[PDB]
């Protein structure tokens, strides 16, 4: 004990028993001081060697280094004064205490080690770390105990040790200041990712991220603001590490499966089990630094339920000394800070390990593709290979994200049952049972929902398709007044969809009701079975409240045991797919020898190559040797292995025997164009430098100059627009810039038109062509290019037939003639969704939720009364009545909590379905009623999207989330009411604490969205590049630029690593700040019980605090929801924006026309002026003429703008400022829009018929009958197709009119008008692209069937215009002409000159 060494008492148990106690001094001066000094000395050698070895370069000494190296020596100055006083006291004739000997001295030894440990620090990247910071903290905390003894003795007035005292009150204070300086991390800006420059403290609190969040709110972020990942995380380093391990295991894996074949010697499958051991040996380091942070969190969590037992008991008995309680509340905060800092780290080490696995597996795929044997690259399809890296590998990231739960669950479940078994006896088995039964019920409902989602997915697609069509043809719909009819079809589709949404929603709400009522049921069943079973069991606050607190912990793990066991059974499948592609046998190119010593560029030695492993070789025993520059064209009978030679050339086929050697680089251009997506220059440059002359020299030969320049982009033009022919040149063009020695091009100009081919023959294969030096082998079937060919060779059935001079080919006495013969604030947004649900439902829903809370606050109070009764009747037997009344009332109090949540939840669903219906029905009505201008300005794509994703967002997401915000808020406010009510003064603290929670939510929420778009933008490229390489694999392997591709993935995977990692850290910054709010509330509230203990009963502490403890999870949850609800609600804003878009004009008016109005047959104009746009000048002005009645009428708009407008005016698609006669005329505004459009009839310029049944296409409203339609079909000669089809008039015309023929499709529209029966009908430049053959029948019908009718025809072809009896040409914003056509020819005027201009 060294009590004699101390010369005083060491451990007096009696010292702490009395109230107002203190630890005996000898303990504080000796055992405690050994703790920190021992820590600092035991682990200094290890740490000093680390810096001694690493020895990175030193940095400028800076002031922080000035102070932490000035104060630390000063602590040695204070140690110094103490040392001497003992020795002066030896001259004071006293027995100086032996502790007073070593204790000042050991310090000198320790303080010295600290000055050395600080020096080394300027020589390593982490300034302060796991060893100095923890030493300091242990010293200030362990040291507090002496500070208590000494201050107390001085307050009494003992001065025996005043001298020692000033030193300890001086050293402790500086000792704290060294911890403060240690927190700061020097602001060297050498690391952009500040993580490399951080102290144990800062990192522990993830405050380095403070800079982005602070600035994120200020302005939008850029791929640039996220700092780059650290090099050890970059793709280059990781792949390397991963690569080494797979090789070793596979070799063994192959060895053992081969051993299975060796077992076959003792007597499909690819080596397996390699993928798993590799992903472990490679990452075992990060693995053994996460098991441990979890063992600290799982063991620390169970301390908090147990300390609560002490605050409850301490309050219960007035006697317990004031000190025990004040110590338990401080102890609470501690175990609430440790758990937090440590769990958040188990997230960072584990969540980032997941990213590592993802990157390693993803980019160890790109590399396998560029060397995979083509033999089995065939089995995986091209889309499927993209999957191996964007679906099956992303699943391996998810399992690793939650891998540790597999043992954490078992532990945090097994310990939790133990503590309950001790606290409440064997009854706790019943309570866990409801938690078990919940798992099967939660699952079945989920399966039922997924069925309904799938059946509903189809209905959605049908509507989307109809929608695409309506918008695509808005002009036509207006022309024939078919819009009202069309709306109905969309609605009938919506009705089926809305009925399904309600049925899923009711079910989703039968899951939220079970989560929210598993906390309640567990309590009634657990407490009741125990009390009722034994009349010797009495519930007390210490048992009940602690058991409740424990339950909340078991509920989280027990729920997860189902999710993970399923996720880790899906992963065995993703691993098997990646365990074959990565393990695939690679291309062996033993047959082809790439070498520089053969005499000729191309050599053959009776080599054989086969497309399939045992299929007969397409090319065998062939021998061609070619000198450089020898342009050779080989034409072989198709199916003679001709295509195969190039395949053998680049190494693609398998080899029966022999070799083919190539000398120089090879540039190969394949038959099917493959285009990397880029601007025109990029696709051509293909990883080479830019030179002005070479580019122009090549481009001019491409002669794509006018073709590309006429196109708007030029170099800027982007291939998302290009026909096979338009870019066929590009496929050859890049080859030209490449300038590799031998070019093997295939069917190069066959796709191109012959005239281009002949000019191009000169450009690349020309005797004077840019490749005249180049040795080129082209295989093609055109002899246009044959005249300048240096050698011509033929090969048949994989056996060469002819070769040598082209002229010799002309007379070889073989089959040349046959060869010739083979010729071939802002609250408004929220207000709208709210106004839509129906404010009246909104009041009832909020009120039942509030009634969930009035029950909640209430239930606890009754439970508190139940427990408090124990004090009064325990010695008795508890009157059996009281036991029963008490058991029952909690029972009902719980059910009420249920009736109210469930009414709230069903009434909500009918509220969301009813919300969606009003929004859609309104959007369709405005968009359908919109003017044409709306449609012209907006790209149709946006309008489809609003009715696509946005109506979807307002159906299955924003509606579900809004349930949690309100619920979680009622929850939070419920607890602060239990705390303010019991201790009134706590109310003041809520105002400061709440403000922190408003600010932390605004910040985290704002930035997480800005980085919420960015992760998505850079996720897409990684998937696309894998596609482009797979479709361009032969080219990229052949023009040997593979290593530029392998290194274009590395930047692309890396831009994702930086955004994803930056996000995974914004989440750690929310958790730490919000948890401090959760712990401060529990600690400040718990002390408040002790300051005001005099009155508080024992139980009140139980309810306020046990509920207070769970303030932590809910606080974060709400910030998470206030995030998704904020982002999703943009969707209600957009749907509302198009509902408020202009409505053009009343469909119908009061002055309906006399019913016989259309029979008039005459039309007039007065000073007509029509704005091209309201802002722009009117296209037509001063238009005045009365057209002929029931007669052919001719109007020429050719060469004149406004030819299109005149039809638009007549059907009044557009209203106009000037020119008007209401009924016998053009001010049809008086009669109303449908009234005018219905009584006029037009046939469109381009035939468009909306998809549907034939009868619907001709008459959507179904206002005619077949007796009539059939006859009309006959008038257009359409009896044959309809009579022939078995369905006939109901034969549904498939989409795009795919089923009908092009001529038949056009004929249908002609039939449409014939049914219309209105004389004032307008034709529409019918022959603009139409052939006369089809036009012949058209001419016959208007000529005969539209007899004596007011046919106003606007036609491009003038000869057709001649037929109309009278003509009124219009041009120059005026009535250009009003003369009969024969008179017009005679008149000397512009029209007659145009007749001369056109050859008429």
Give an overview of the whole structure:
The protein is mainly alpha-helical and 1400 residues long. The protein has a 6-stranded mixed sheet with strand order 8-9-10-5-11-12, with helices on both faces. A 5-stranded parallel sheet has the order 18-19-20-17-21. It starts with a helix and ends with a helix. Among the domains are: 3-194, no CATH class; 592-821, P-loop containing nucleotide triphosphate hydrolases (Rossmann fold, 3-Layer(aba) Sandwich), CATH 3.40.50; 1243-1306, no CATH class. It is globular and about 145 Å long.
In total, the number of strands is 21
- What profile does the largest beta sheet have? 6 strands, mixed
Shape: globular
The CATH superfamily of the domain at 592-821 is known as: P-loop containing nucleotide triphosphate hydrolases
Structural class: mainly alpha
Which CATH class of the domain at 592-821?
Alpha Beta
Cα(first) to Cα(last) distance is 128 Å
At a glance:
It is found in: Apical cell membrane. This protein is mainly α and 1400 residues long.
Secondary-structure blueprint:
Layout: H1 3-6, H2 13-17, H3 25-42, H4 44-54, H5 63-68, H6 71-90, H7 99-121, H8 132-156, H9 162-183, H10 200-204, H11 210-218, H12 235-266, H13 274-281, H14 284-287, H15 291-301, H16 303-316, H17 322-369, H18 374-377, H19 382-390, H20 392-401, H21 405-424, H22 428-472, H23 474-480, H24 483-516, H25 518-533, H26 541-581, E1 592-594, E2 602-604, E3 607-610, E4 619-622, E5 632-634, H27 642-649, E6 654-655, E7 660-662, E8 666-669, H28 680-685, H29 692-702, H30 704-710, H31 724-738, E9 742-746, H32 754-765, E10 775-779, E11 791-796, E12 799-802, H33 806-810, H34 816-821, H35 827-837, H36 839-873, H37 880-929, H38 932-937, H39 940-956, H40 958-982, H41 987-1031, H42 1033-1038, H43 1042-1091, H44 1098-1109, H45 1111-1128, H46 1130-1139, E13 1163-1164, E14 1168-1171, E15 1178-1183, E16 1186-1187, E17 1193-1195, H47 1203-1210, H48 1233-1239, E18 1241-1242, H49 1254-1258, H50 1266-1275, H51 1279-1284, H52 1302-1316, E19 1321-1324, H53 1332-1344, E20 1352-1354, H54 1358-1363, E21 1366-1367, H55 1381-1386, H56 1390-1397
Parallel strand pairs: 1-7, 5-10, 5-11, 8-9, 9-10, 17-20, 17-21, 18-19, 19-20
Antiparallel strand pairs: 2-7, 3-4, 3-6, 11-12, 13-16, 14-15
Helix pairs in contact: 3-7, 3-8, 4-7, 6-7, 6-9, 8-9, 11-41, 12-13, 12-17, 15-17, 16-17, 16-26, 16-44, 17-20, 17-43, 19-41, 20-26, 21-26, 22-24, 22-25, 22-26, 22-39, 24-37, 25-26, 25-37, 26-44, 29-31, 35-36, 35-46, 36-37, 36-40, 36-44, 37-39, 37-46, 39-46, 40-44, 40-45, 41-43, 41-45, 43-44, ...
């Amino acid at each position: 004990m060294l009590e004699k060494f101390c010369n005083s008492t060491f451990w007096n148990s009696s010292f702490l028993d009395s109230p107002e106690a203190d630890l005996p001094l000898c303990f504080e001066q000796t055992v405690l001081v050994w703790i920190p000094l021992g820590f600092l000395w035991l682990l200094a050698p290890w740490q000093l060697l680390h810096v001694y070895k690493s020895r990175t370069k030193r940095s400028s000494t800076t002031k922080l280094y000035l102070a932490k190296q000035v104060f630390v020596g000063f602590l040695l100055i204070l140690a110094a004064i103490e040392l001497a006083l003992v020795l002066t006291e030896d001259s004071g004739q006293a027995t100086v205490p032996a502790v007073r000997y070593t204790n000042p001295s050991l310090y000198l030894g320790t303080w010295l080690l600290v000055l050395l440990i600080q020096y080394s620090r300027q020589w390593c990247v982490q300034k302060n770390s796991w060893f100095l910071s923890l030493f300091w903290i242990l010293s200030i905390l362990c040291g507090t105990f002496q500070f208590q003894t000494l201050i107390r003795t001085l307050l009494q007035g003992d001065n025996s040790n005043l001298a020692y005292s000033c030193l300890f009150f001086i050293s402790y204070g500086f000792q704290i200041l060294i911890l403060i300086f240690s927190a700061f991390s020097e602001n060297n800006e050498s690391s952009n990712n500040p993580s490399s420059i951080a102290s144990f403290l800062s990192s522990i609190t993830y405050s380095w991220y403070d800079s982005i969040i602070l600035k994120g709110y200020k302005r939008p972020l850029t791929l640039e603001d996220v700092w780059e990942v650290d090099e050890e995380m970059k793709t280059k380093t990781l792949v390397s590490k991963f690569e080494t391990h797979m090789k070793r295991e596979l070799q063994k894996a192959r060895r053992a499966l081969q051993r299975r074949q060796e077992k076959s010697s003792q007597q499909k499958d690819v080596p397996k089990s390699w993928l798993m051991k590799a992903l472990f040996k490679t990452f075992y380091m990060v693995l053994l630094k996460s098991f441990l942070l979890k063992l600290v969190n799982d063991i620390f969590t169970f301390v908090s339920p147990q300390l609560l037992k002490l605050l409850i008991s301490f309050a219960s008995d007035r006697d317990t000394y004031l000190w025990i309680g004040y110590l338990c509340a401080i102890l609470l905060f501690t175990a609430a800070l440790i758990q937090s800092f440590c769990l958040q780290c188990y997230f960072q080490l584990c969540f980032k390990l997941g990213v590592k696995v993802r990157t390693a597996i993803m980019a160890s795929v790109y590399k396998k593709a560029l060397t995979l044997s083509n033999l089995a690259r065939k089995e995986y399809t091209v889309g499927e290979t993209v999957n191996l890296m964007s679906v099956d590998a992303q699943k391996l990231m998810d399992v690793t994200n939650f891998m540790h739960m597999l043992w954490s669950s078992v532990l945090q479940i097994v310990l939790s049952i133990f503590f309950l078994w001790r606290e409440l006896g064997p009854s706790v088995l019943a309570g866990v049972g409801v938690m078990v039964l919940v798992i099967p019920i939660n699952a079945i409902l989920s399966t039922k929902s997924k069925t309904i989602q799938v059946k509903n997915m189809k209905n959605k697609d049908k509507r989307l398709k109809i929608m695409n069509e309506i918008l695509s043809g808005i002009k036509i719909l207006k022309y024939f007044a078919w819009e009202p009819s069309f709306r109905d079809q969309v609605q009938n589709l919506r009705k089926k969809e809305l009925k399904n949404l309600l049925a899923f929603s009711q079910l989703q709400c039968v899951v939220i009701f079970v989560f929210q009522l598993t906390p309640v049921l567990v309590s009634v069943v657990t407490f009741s079975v125990y009390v009722l079973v034994d009349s010797n069991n009495i519930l007390d606050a210490q048992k009940a409240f602690t058991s409740i607190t424990l339950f909340n912990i078991l509920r989280f793990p027990l729920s997860m045991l189902p999710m993970m066991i399923s996720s880790m059974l899906q992963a065995s499948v993703s691993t098997e797919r990646l365990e074959k592609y990565l393990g695939g046998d690679d291309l062996d190119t033993s047959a082809i020898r790439h070498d520089c010593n053969f005499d000729k560029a191309m050599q053959f030695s009776e080599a054989s190559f086969t497309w399939e492993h045992d299929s007969e070789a397409t090319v065998r025993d062939v021998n061609l040797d070619i000198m450089a520059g020898q342009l050779v064209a080989v034409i072989g009978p198709v199916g003679s292995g001709k295509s195969s030679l190039i395949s053998a050339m680049l190494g693609e086929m398998e080899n029966v025997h022999g070799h083919i050697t190539i000398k120089g680089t090879t540039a190969y251009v394949p038959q099917q164009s493959w285009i990397q997506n880029g601007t025109i220059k990029d696709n051509i440059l293909f990883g080479t430098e830019f030179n002005e002359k070479r580019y122009q020299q090549v481009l001019e030969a491409c002669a794509l100059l006018p073709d590309l320049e006429m196109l708007p982009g030029g170099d800027l033009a982007e291939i998302g627009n290009l026909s096979g022919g338009q870019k066929q040149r590009i496929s050859l063009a890049r080859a030209t810039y490449q300038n590799l020695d031998i070019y093997l091009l295939d069917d190069p100009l066959s796709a191109v038109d012959a005239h281009v081919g002949k000019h191009i023959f000169n450009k690349v294969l020309g005797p004077n062509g840019l490749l005249k030096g180049k040795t080129r082998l082209l295989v093609t079937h055109s002899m246009h290019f044959l005249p300048q060919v240096d050698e011509i060779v033929v090969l048949g059935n994989g056996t060469i037939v002819e070769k040598g001079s082209y002229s010799a080919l002309l007379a070889k006495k073989g089959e040349f003639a046959k060869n010739l013969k083979t010729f071939l604030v802002k609250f408004s947004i929220y207000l709208e969704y709210l106004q839509a649900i129906g404010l009246f439902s909104i009041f009832f829903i909020i009120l039942a939720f509030v009634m969930n809370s009035v029950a909640f606050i209430g239930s606890n109070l009754w439970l508190s009364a139940w427990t408090s009764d124990s004090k009064i009747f325990n010695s008795t037997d508890y009157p059996a009545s009281q036991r029963d009344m008490r058991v029952g009332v909690y029972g009902a109090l719980g059910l009420a909590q249920g009736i109210f949540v469930f009414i709230a939840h069903f009434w909500s669903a009918f509220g969301f379905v009813h919300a969606s219906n009003i929004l859609h029905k309104q959007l369709l009505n405005n968009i359908l009623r919109a003017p044409m201008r709306f449609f012209d300005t907006t790209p149709t794509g946006r309008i489809v999207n609003r009715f696509a994703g946005d109506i979807s967002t307002v159906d299955d997401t924003l509606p579900q989330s809004l349930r949690s915000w309100i619920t979680c808020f009622l929850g939070i406010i419920s607890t602060l009411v239990m705390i303010c009510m019991a201790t009134p003064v706590f109310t003041i603290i809520v105002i400061p604490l709440g403000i922190i929670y408003v600010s932390v939510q605004m910040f985290y929420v704002s930035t997480s969205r800005q980085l919420r778009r960015l992760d998505s933008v850079t996720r897409s490229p990684i998937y696309s590049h894998f596609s482009e390489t797979v479709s361009g694999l032969p080219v990229i392997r052949a023009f040997e630029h593979q290593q530029r591709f392998l290194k274009h993935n590395e930047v692309r995977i890396d831009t994702n690593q930086k955004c994803v990692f930056s996000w995974i850290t914004s989440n750690r910054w929310l958790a730490i700040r919000l948890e401090l709010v959760g712990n401060l509330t529990v600690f400040f509230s718990a002390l408040m019980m002790v300051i005001y203990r005099d009155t508080l009963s024992g139980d009140t502490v139980g309810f306020v605090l046990s509920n207070a403890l769970n303030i932590t999870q809910t606080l974060n949850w709400l910030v998470r929801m206030t995030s998704e609800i904020e982002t999703n609600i943009v969707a209600v804003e957009r749907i509302t924006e198009y509902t408020k878009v202009e409505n053009e004009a009343p469909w119908v008016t009061d002055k309906r026309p006399p019913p016989d109005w259309p029979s008039k047959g005459k039309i007039q104009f007065n000073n007509y002026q029509v704005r091209y746009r309201p802002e722009l000048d009117l296209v037509l002005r001063g238009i005045t003429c009365d057209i002929g009645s029931m007669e052919k009428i001719g109007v020429v708009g050719r060469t004149g703008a406004g030819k299109s407008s005149l039809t638009n005016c007549l059907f009044r698609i557009l209203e106009a400022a000037g020119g008007q006669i209401i009924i016998d005329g053009v001010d049809i505004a008086s009669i109303g829009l449908h009234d005018l459009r219905e009584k006029l009839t037009i046939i469109p310029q381009d035939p468009i018929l909306f998809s549907g049944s034939l009868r619907m296409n001709l008459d959507p409203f179904n206002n005619y009958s077949d007796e009539e339609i059939w006859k009309a079909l006959e008038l257009a000669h359409l009896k044959s197709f309809v009579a022939s089809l078995q369905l006939g008039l109901s034969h549904e015309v498939t989409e795009a009119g795919g089923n009908l023929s092009i001529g038949q499709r056009q004929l249908l529209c002609l039939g449409r008008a014939l049914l219309r029966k209105s004389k004032i009908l307008v034709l529409d430049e019918a022959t603009a692209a139409v052939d006369l053959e089809t036009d012949n029948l058209i001419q016959t019908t208007i000529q005969n069937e539209f007899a004596h009718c007011t046919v106003i025809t606007i036609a491009h072809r003038l000869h057709t215009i001649m037929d109309s009896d009278k003509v009124m040409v219009l041009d120059n914003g005026k009535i250009i002409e009003c003369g009969s056509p024969e008179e017009l020819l005679q008149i000397p005027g512009p029209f007659y000159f145009m007749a001369k201009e056109a050859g008429i």
